[PDB]
Design a protein around this ligand. Sequence first.
Ligand SMILES: Nc1ncnc2c1ncn2[C@@H]1O[C@H](COP(=O)(O)OP(=O)(O)OC[C@H]2O[C@H](O)[C@H](O)[C@@H]2O)[C@@H](O)[C@H]1O
Length: 169
Amino acid sequence: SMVNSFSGYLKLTDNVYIKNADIVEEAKKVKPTVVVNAANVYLKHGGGVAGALNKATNNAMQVESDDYIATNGPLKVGGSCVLSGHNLAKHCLHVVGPNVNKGEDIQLLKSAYENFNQHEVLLAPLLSAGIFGADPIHSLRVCVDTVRTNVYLAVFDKNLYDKLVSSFL
Ligand SMILES: Nc1ncnc2c1ncn2[C@@H]1O[C@H](COP(=O)(O)OP(=O)(O)OC[C@H]2O[C@H](O)[C@H](O)[C@@H]2O)[C@@H](O)[C@H]1O
C-alpha cells in the first residue's frame, strides 16, 4: 500500500481521520489517488466542495462531467462515478448524498458512503452536510460506521470542526 503525505489529521477511529482544512488545498498539497466530491445527480458543480474543486481545475472537471452525463445520464442519489482528478488528484470519486432539504431520504447517506469502500484511501468531505441539509454530526457518524477503507476528512469550517471533534461518534 502506498504512503501519502497527509499531515496534521486527528485520528477518529482505526480508519477515519479528520482535519480543519479546505479540501482543495489538501488535494493540491497531497495529490491523493482519490479525492471525493459531494455531487448532485447532474454533476453540476456549483458551490461548496464541488464548485471549489471544479474552479481549481479551471472548469475541466465540469467539461468532463458534462460529457459523462451526456453519455450516461444522471447518477442515482447515493450513487457515484469515477472521473479524472485533473490537477488535484489521480481520480475524483463523485458521490451523491441525499438532498435532505428537498425531501430525499437521509438513509441514502449510508449508500453514498458505501462507495468509499471501493477505494483503499480517499480524501473526502462530509457528504450532505452543507447545502443538502443533513446534520453534520450525523454525516460523520454514518461515515465512521460505514467506511472501512482509509478516509481523510477535510472540514472547511472551523466552528464545525471544533464541534465535531468533541462529539461522541
Ligand atoms: N472547500 C471545502 N473544503 C472542505 N469542506 C468544504 C468545502 N466547502 C464546503 N465544505 C463542507 O463540505 C460539507 C458538504 O457541503 P456541500 O459541498 O454543500 O455538499 P452537500 O453534499 O451538502 O451538497 C451537495 C451540493 O453541493 C454543491 O453545490 C454540489 O454541486 C451539490 O449540488 C459541508 O460540511 C461544508 O461545510
